[PDB]
């Protein structure tokens, strides 16, 4: 039904500026209130700022004052947020969530969320963007049960982190053990992934594991081969 | 404003919890609660202490009384480990102010035994010098696992490892583990293995001496 889609992040130098994009799908784009509310790591959320049914801008925090803007389109249906003088401090999950009440013209001002959205991952350091390195890893001939055997990618070598994996064209939701990454003591980060993989008698995928990085494109189409 | 919260609360699922929020003078205007699980996108509960979302059982709940917002859980499952937040409007600063989730943990499930895996190499990558090797471990309930590596049959931890926390899987702990301080010639003999201490029964597994 609702398909709030977000775009916009990645590795970004202290002190520059970026556009933050949330589109919406299912709903009338005039009639319902859409906030920014970040998500630090671990580190609970926190409110960003937010824009009414119409233009109307609502209010920011204590530390987003003077630096962020934001502005909604009615024509294209969409909320932009623009942020300037990014600082080491600003490295959280930028959500776009939704409201719930039509907002009448009289009432009593308050606000809450009602759908949200995934979130980019908009890190701001020093550093920068390392290619991904995908490997083909060996699915050894230790057969014991029925699928003991499995086969993943070795992705490595990349500071942010977008991990977005697709085997043939973004279906076989069944189960798949995607292992979360780790800083390795020198700000690169490692996927992996664990499939079924069940006896191969020409029967099983094509052995493709396609990882999309944004801020390092590369289209990766290499094969698996025991 | 500023709301305080409490940083863990656990409870067997036997019986109901207590998540409060409370304030200064918090006693008449609205307190919403919503729960976001470990990796998911967080949902809508209970809000405003009288009504619910379309989908949101009657096991959920809140009430206010003075000064304290609580949510009560009613029949707590496995399933229902997530992070709960209050959030407050607070119109004298026209701000959103949020606060520290709590971590609901169902104390008193049963054991699972996690399972350890072996990758061995890729085939095309010995021409260059990667020395990516790494050993995966399966879910499990019991954390705060430390993985032992036995590096040429031998205990070898001067290397650089990861050693990465256990992480949130459909309500169970995972985790990783990789050393490769080998200088890439990592088939010498003795059978390079991996093992994984946990508490109680610790795990191994070995490769092909090649």
Same mark, same amino acid.
Request: proline share 7%.
């Given at each position: 039904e609702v398909q709030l889609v977000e775009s916009?992040?990645?590795?970004?130098?202290?002190?520059?500026?970026?556009?933050?994009?949330?589109a919406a799908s299912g709903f009338t784009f005039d009639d319902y209130a859409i906030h920014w509310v970040r998500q630090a790591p671990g580190k609970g959320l926190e409110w960003v700022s937010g824009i009414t049914w119409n233009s109307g801008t609502i209010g920011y925090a204590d530390s987003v004052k003077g630096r962020f803007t934001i502005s909604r389109d009615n024509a294209?249906?969409?909320?932009?947020?623009?942020?300037?003088?990014?600082?080491?401090?600003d490295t959280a999950l930028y959500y776009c969530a939704k409201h719930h009440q039509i907002a009448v013209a009289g009432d009593a001002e308050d606000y809450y969320?009602?759908?949200?959205?995934?979130?980019?991952? /908009? =890190? $701001? &350091?020093?550093? *920068?963007?390392?290619?991904? +390195?995908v490997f083909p890893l060996?699915?050894?001939?230790?057969?014991?049960?029925?699928?003991?055997?499995?086969?993943?990618?070795?992705?490595?070598?990349?500071?942010?982190?977008? /991990? =977005? $994996? &697709?085997?043939? *064209?973004?279906?076989?939701? +069944?189960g798949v053990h995607t292992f979360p990454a780790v800083l390795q003591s020198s700000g690169l980060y490692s996927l992996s992934s664990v499939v079924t993989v069940p006896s191969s008698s020409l029967g099983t995928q094509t052995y493709i594991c396609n990882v999309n990085h944004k801020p390092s494109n590369t289209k990766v189409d290499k094969k698996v081969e025991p | 404003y500023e709301l305080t919260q409490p940083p863990s609360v656990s409870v067997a699922p036997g019986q109901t919890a207590r998540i409060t929020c409370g304030g200064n003078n918090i006693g008449s205007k609205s307190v919403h609660w919503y729960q976001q699980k470990p990796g998911?996108?967080?949902?809508?509960?209970?809000?405003?202490?009288?009504?619910?979302?379309?989908?949101?059982?009657?096991?959920?709940?809140?009430?206010?009384?003075?000064?304290?917002?609580?949510?009560?859980?009613?029949?707590?499952?496995?399933?229902?480990?997530?992070?709960?937040?209050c959030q407050v409007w607070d119109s004298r600063s026209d701000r959103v102010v949020f606060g520290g989730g709590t971590k609901?943990?169902?104390?008193?499930?049963?054991?699972?035994?996690?399972?350890?895996?072996?990758?061995?190499?890729?085939?095309?990558?010995?021409?260059?010098?990667?020395?990516?090797?790494?050993?995966?471990?399966?879910?499990?309930?019991?954390?705060?696992?430390?993985?032992?590596?036995?590096?040429?049959?031998?205990?070898?931890?001067?290397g650089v490892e990861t050693t990465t926390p256990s992480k949130q899987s459909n309500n169970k702990y995972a985790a990783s583990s990789?050393?490769?301080?080998?200088?890439?010639?990592?088939?010498?003999?003795?059978?390079?293995s991996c093992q994984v201490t946990h508490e109680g029964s610790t795990v191994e597994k070995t490769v092909a001496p090649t």
């Open positions: 916009g992040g990645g590795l970004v130098q202290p002190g520059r500026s970026l556009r933050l994009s949330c294209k249906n969409s909320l932009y947020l623009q942020m300037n003088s990014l600082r080491a401090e969320f009602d759908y949200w959205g995934q979130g980019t991952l /908009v =890190t $701001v &350091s020093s550093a *920068s963007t390392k290619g991904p +390195s060996a699915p050894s001939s230790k057969s014991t049960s029925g699928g003991t055997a499995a086969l993943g990618c070795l992705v490595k070598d990349y500071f942010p982190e977008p /991990v =977005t $994996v &697709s085997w043939n *064209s973004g279906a076989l939701t +069944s | 998911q996108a967080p949902v809508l509960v209970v809000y405003d202490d009288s009504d619910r979302p379309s989908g949101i059982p009657e096991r959920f709940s809140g009430s206010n009384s003075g000064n304290t917002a609580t949510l009560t859980i009613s029949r707590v499952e496995a399933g229902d480990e997530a992070d709960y937040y609901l943990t169902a104390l008193g499930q049963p054991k699972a035994a996690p399972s350890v895996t072996l990758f061995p190499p890729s085939s095309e990558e010995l021409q260059a010098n990667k020395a990516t090797l790494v050993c995966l471990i399966s879910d499990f309930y019991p954390g705060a696992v430390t993985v032992a590596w036995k590096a040429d049959s031998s205990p070898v931890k001067a990789y050393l490769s301080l080998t200088p890439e010639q990592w088939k010498s003999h003795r059978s390079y």
